Design a protein around this nucleic acid. Structure first.
Ligand SMILES: [Mg+2]
Ligand SMILES: [Mg+2]
Ligand SMILES: [Mg+2]
Ligand SMILES: [Mg+2]
Ligand SMILES: [Mg+2]
Ligand SMILES: [Mg+2]
Ligand SMILES: [Mg+2]
Ligand SMILES: [Mg+2]
Ligand SMILES: [Mg+2]
Ligand SMILES: [Mg+2]
Ligand SMILES: [Mg+2]
Ligand SMILES: [Mg+2]
Ligand SMILES: [Mg+2]
Ligand SMILES: [Mg+2]
Ligand SMILES: [Mg+2]
Ligand SMILES: [Mg+2]
Ligand SMILES: [Mg+2]
Ligand SMILES: [Mg+2]
Ligand SMILES: [Mg+2]
Ligand SMILES: [Mg+2]
Ligand SMILES: [Mg+2]
Ligand SMILES: [Mg+2]
Ligand SMILES: [Mg+2]
Ligand SMILES: [Mg+2]
Ligand SMILES: [Mg+2]
Ligand SMILES: [Mg+2]
Ligand SMILES: [Mg+2]
Ligand SMILES: [Mg+2]
Ligand SMILES: [Mg+2]
Ligand SMILES: [Mg+2]
Ligand SMILES: [Mg+2]
Ligand SMILES: [Mg+2]
Ligand SMILES: [Mg+2]
Ligand SMILES: [Mg+2]
Ligand SMILES: [Mg+2]
Ligand SMILES: [Mg+2]
Ligand SMILES: [Mg+2]
Ligand SMILES: [Mg+2]
Ligand SMILES: [Mg+2]
Ligand SMILES: [Mg+2]
Ligand SMILES: [Mg+2]
Ligand SMILES: [Mg+2]
Ligand SMILES: [Mg+2]
Ligand SMILES: [Mg+2]
Ligand SMILES: [Mg+2]
Ligand SMILES: [Mg+2]
Ligand SMILES: [Mg+2]
Ligand SMILES: [Mg+2]
Ligand SMILES: [Mg+2]
Ligand SMILES: [Mg+2]
Ligand SMILES: [Mg+2]
Ligand SMILES: [Mg+2]
Ligand SMILES: [Mg+2]
Ligand SMILES: [Mg+2]
Ligand SMILES: [Mg+2]
Ligand SMILES: [Zn+2]
Lengths: 83, 118, 69, 112, 181, 23
RNA sequence: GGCGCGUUAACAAAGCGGUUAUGUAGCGGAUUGCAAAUCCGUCUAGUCCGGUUCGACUCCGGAACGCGCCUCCA
RNA sequence: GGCGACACACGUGCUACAAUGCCCACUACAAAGCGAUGCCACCCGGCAACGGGGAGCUAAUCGCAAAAAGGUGGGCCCAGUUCGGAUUGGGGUCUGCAACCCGACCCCAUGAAGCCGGAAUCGCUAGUAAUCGCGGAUCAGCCAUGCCGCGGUGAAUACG
RNA sequence: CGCCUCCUAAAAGGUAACGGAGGCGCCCAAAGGUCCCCUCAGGCGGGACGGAAAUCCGCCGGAGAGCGCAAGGGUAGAAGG
């Protein structure tokens, strides 16, 4: 992992969009590109459209997924199986 | 069920014997024997039950073992399964999790080969 | 009871590792258990072992909050 | 017509073993195009060459509109390339034929 | 009848709590234990071997009672079994041997169970009886890993004169039956 | 074996150091 | 129509009341410049309906289709 | 975002299947190279990865540096194991704007397949083959078990 | 082509057709005698492996089970175990 003695990373144009809305009386669908972002408790509740290279995936966020990134839950490899 | 709910092999070394239990690696194999005043390099076929229960009480209280370990990890993968994280997908379909290549091997993760016609 | 077929019962002294002793009857006059009722985790209340959790994942990480407002 | 299912008859033309291989290129080309149309295919008659090609393949394209789409393929398709069967590196000009037939009725016959 | 620890506990502590908690006017209305009937549905020694003789040897070491053979009512192809084969062992425990069995069952055996989260609170007969299974035989005290040779569990039937599940739910728990939920 | 990173030679093979092959 | 025989997998074709038939093909590998041949492995089943039996491809009854024989004296 | 996909199939390698071996402690003997947002001594915190300090060296001077097999002693006793190191969970380190896809390393736990490989098939004639460790280029980091090198130890057999 | 069961057979018996449907040419050394004991099928709930169905417990369940083999009659107040 990105070593803990740094700041737990959020692209900080996005965490803004989650706490600028905690003021405004949310919730919106915010379309992002920072898949590289740790989920924070300030995001629990919102809808974020995590891009995957082609399309914007609505990814609501809950309280079992905080440490994990936004880009995990927006996979990019449509598979279905083989055969 | 000698210790942690598992009988441990006789005629073996007490540090090796503890490895013969789910949750006890070689690093935890020694940790007890020093911190229990227990001679590592002797059989289980020559042990007093004072040391035995001292050993048993130590390892069952200090360390999540046999069942509890199995269930806890069993629950952790499940969370990734539930939420729909990438590792949860790749835990359902039996694919790798740590980013290995799949074009060839992964056979441990994918069992014997499903040979194809064509 | 039929004679000659049944293992006769005698007063027994079962023994757990925790020094708990139980006045029972058995086929053996003494046994030496390792777990009993008097010290089982599910039995002695919660007796929550190493899992005094709180999870403790994951919002509870709180390993930061330096990220600005 | 246009809306009924279709039978496609691919036959190797002039070219011998390479016409048969090209016939299989035409064959795989149509099976895929069927997928990208929601059409269902099923092979009724296949005559493989031991080199991988087909001296003749007959398959149906099942789905509303098959004879509407596939009908524009009935004819002679020319290939110009260096065959896998060529050894002096020359370009050969081989042909494969495609025949498109609307699926038939097995209509029962009784005496009036 | 001899002093049995659990037997005493039934009379001195369980009896009045039930009268209290339920209010029966008659000393016989208050629920009791009728019998405990243990059944190993072995079925592996159908033809494979005479492994039963060792299981009846262990089931006797656990209960003090030689069990009785059970046999196949009809013949079953898929079970690889003809009508009349020895396919199990039943033993019926009453009175003290019933008490002495549960005393060790609740105190030492159900604890020595691997990964034990309590008895299922839903296994009640619907008419005041209870049934629980098991996966092993070393769980019980008298069965050592030396003498073990095969992993054979059992079914357990506990029969009560209680008329309803709730009367029987209270009777068992007051004796020491660890219920999960 | 040279792949067992939890051993002397395993760390030798990888050239890295730790509890099992210290500097 | 009567009587006898049959229906098994990709094809041809057997045994069997409980059980990878087999040959060829097909499928993966080897060999070969490549194909064949050859070598190492491998594989898909019992026409439908109803009975008997613990159990039916296997036994019994019927249907369906196919084969073979007969239908003569007026 | 993908080039890192995975019903499958092939080539080149790594690691093994163990006792002429594994493990641990202790003690040896190289060569060739690299090194100023660099090698890093030495010390402290850290099980460790590393982190903090902090000399020397523009380098036959300072450092990378331990060479390793080996040598000595001790342990494992033939067990899918004190063989093997895959897989996964969890806890960390580092780089970099950023390690989800998709990095590397450490630690804890987990200890898989594999009992020497069918038809077949590759290399090598001497300091060669086998085995052993070491350096470099690229390079923030590294998926290198690859390549180009370097020395250590060191055979068998060639009738024809 | 002989024998058994049912129907046809018209409520005693009997009653035909190249009428409608089945079966027999065995078997059992206990599947026989007697004394003693026992009672099914099935349905629901409950119970490790264990399933529609193996064995265990509870409740309901007069006979729909069983009685070697066809059918009928008979049958647990036993002919059944
Ligand atoms: Mg272990
Ligand atoms: Mg991980
Ligand atoms: Mg990798
Ligand atoms: Mg990958
Ligand atoms: Mg008694
Ligand atoms: Mg030519
Ligand atoms: Mg009263
Ligand atoms: Mg219930
Ligand atoms: Mg009751
Ligand atoms: Mg005719
Ligand atoms: Mg046949
Ligand atoms: Mg055929
Ligand atoms: Mg034949
Ligand atoms: Mg025959
Ligand atoms: Mg065959
Ligand atoms: Mg073949
Ligand atoms: Mg082949
Ligand atoms: Mg059939
Ligand atoms: Mg049948
Ligand atoms: Mg049938
Ligand atoms: Mg069959
Ligand atoms: Mg048939
Ligand atoms: Mg027939
Ligand atoms: Mg005449
Ligand atoms: Mg590429
Ligand atoms: Mg490689
Ligand atoms: Mg460099
Ligand atoms: Mg170095
Ligand atoms: Mg193993
Ligand atoms: Mg094996
Ligand atoms: Mg190892
Ligand atoms: Mg990455
Ligand atoms: Mg091991
Ligand atoms: Mg061996
Ligand atoms: Mg060899
Ligand atoms: Mg030469
Ligand atoms: Mg070696
Ligand atoms: Mg580099
Ligand atoms: Mg290197
Ligand atoms: Mg006559
Ligand atoms: Mg006669
Ligand atoms: Mg009459
Ligand atoms: Mg009549
Ligand atoms: Mg009359
Ligand atoms: Mg008369
Ligand atoms: Mg008549
Ligand atoms: Mg006699
Ligand atoms: Mg009889
Ligand atoms: Mg009789
Ligand atoms: Mg008699
Ligand atoms: Mg039931
Ligand atoms: Mg059942
Ligand atoms: Mg009847
Ligand atoms: Mg019968
Ligand atoms: Mg009959
Ligand atoms: Zn205790």
């Amino acid at each position: 992992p990105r070593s803990l003695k740094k700041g737990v990373f959020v692209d900080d144009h996005l965490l803004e969009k989650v706490l600028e809305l905690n003021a405004k009386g949310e919730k919106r669908l915010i379309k992002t590109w920072s898949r590289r972002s740790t989920i924070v408790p300030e995001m629990v509740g919102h809808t974020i459209a995590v891009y995957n290279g082609k399309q914007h995936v609505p990814v609501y966020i809950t309280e079992n997924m905080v440490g994990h990134k936004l880009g995990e839950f927006a996979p990019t490899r449509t598979y279905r199986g083989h055969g | 069920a000698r210790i942690a709910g598992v009988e441990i092999p006789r005629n073996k070394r007490v540090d090796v014997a503890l490895t013969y239990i789910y949750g006890i690696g070689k690093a935890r194999a020694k940790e007890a024997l020093e911190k229990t005043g227990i001679n590592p390099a002797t059989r289980v076929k020559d042990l007093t039950e004072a040391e035995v229960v001292r050993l048993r009480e130590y390892v069952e209280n200090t360390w999540k073992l046999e069942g509890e370990l199995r269930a806890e990890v069993a629950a952790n993968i499940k969370r990734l399964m539930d939420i729909g994280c990438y590792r949860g997908l790749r835990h359902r379909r039996g694919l790798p999790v740590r980013g290995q290549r799949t074009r060839t091997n992964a056979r441990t993760r994918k069992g014997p080969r499903k040979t194809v016609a064509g | 009871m039929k004679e000659g077929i049944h293992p006769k019962l005698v007063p027994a002294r079962i023994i757990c590792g925790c020094g708990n002793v139980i006045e029972t009857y058995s086929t053996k006059p003494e046994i030496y258990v390792e777990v009993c009722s008097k010290c089982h985790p599910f039995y002695t209340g919660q007796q929550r072992f190493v899992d005094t959790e709180g999870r403790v994942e994951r919002f509870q990480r709180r390993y930061g909050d330096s990220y600005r407002k | 017509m246009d809306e009924r299912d279709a039978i496609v008859e691919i036959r190797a033309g002039t070219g011998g073993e390479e016409a048969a291989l090209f016939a299989r290129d035409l064959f795989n080309m149509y099976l895929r195009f069927a997928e990208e149309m929601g059409f269902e295919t099923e092979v009724l008659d296949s005559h493989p060459t031991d080199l991988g090609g087909f001296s003749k393949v007959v398959f149906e394209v099942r789905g509303p509109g098959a004879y509407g789409t596939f009908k524009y393929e009935s004819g002679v398709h020319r290939v110009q390339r260096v065959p896998v069967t060529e050894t002096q590196g020359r370009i050969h000009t081989s042909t494969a034929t495609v025949a498109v037939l609307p699926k038939a009725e097995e209509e029962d016959f009784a005496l009036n | 009848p001899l002093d049995v620890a659990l037997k005493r506990k039934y009379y001195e502590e369980v009896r009045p709590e039930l009268i209290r908690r339920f209010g029966y006017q008659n000393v016989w209305e208050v629920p009791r234990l009728e019998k405990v009937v243990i059944n190993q549905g072995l079925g592996e020694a159908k033809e494979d071997a005479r492994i039963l003789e060792k299981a009846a040897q262990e089931l006797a070491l656990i209960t003090g009672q030689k069990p009785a053979v059970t046999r196949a009512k009809k013949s079953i192809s898929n079970f690889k079994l003809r009508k009349g084969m020895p396919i199990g062992l039943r033993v019926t425990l009453r009175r003290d041997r019933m008490w002495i069995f549960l005393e060790k069952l609740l105190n030492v055996a159900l604890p020595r169970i691997r990964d034990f989260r309590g008895l299922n609170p839903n296994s009640f007969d619907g008419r005041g009886n209870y049934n629980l299974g098991l996966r092993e035989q070393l769980i019980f005290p008298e069965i050592t890993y030396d003498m073990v040779d095969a992993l054979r569990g059992m079914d357990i039937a506990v029969v009560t004169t209680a008329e309803t599940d709730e009367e029987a739910r209270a009777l068992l728990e007051l004796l020491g039956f660890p219920f999960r939920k | 074996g040279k792949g067992d990173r939890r051993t002397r030679r395993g760390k030798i093979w990888r050239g890295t150091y730790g509890k099992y092959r210290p500097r």
